[PDB]
Amino acid sequence: YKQCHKKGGHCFPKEKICLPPSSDFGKMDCRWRWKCCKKGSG
Incomplete structure (x- = not known):
């Protein structure tokens, strides 16, 4: 989960x-689909 939390990304x-977008980037280090x-x- 590290890289996710780096961009403040909680995992959703x-x-x-x-x-609104930009903050939701795509994926960092979540489950492959989340x-x-x-x-x-x-």
Whole structure:
């Protein structure tokens, strides 16, 4: 989980859709299918 948490990325499912974008990058170091955004959307 390190690289994820580096970008503040908590680890979230693609289905969650973190918006607004940029902070949700794509994937760092999550499960191969999940994504990450900086800890902050809702």
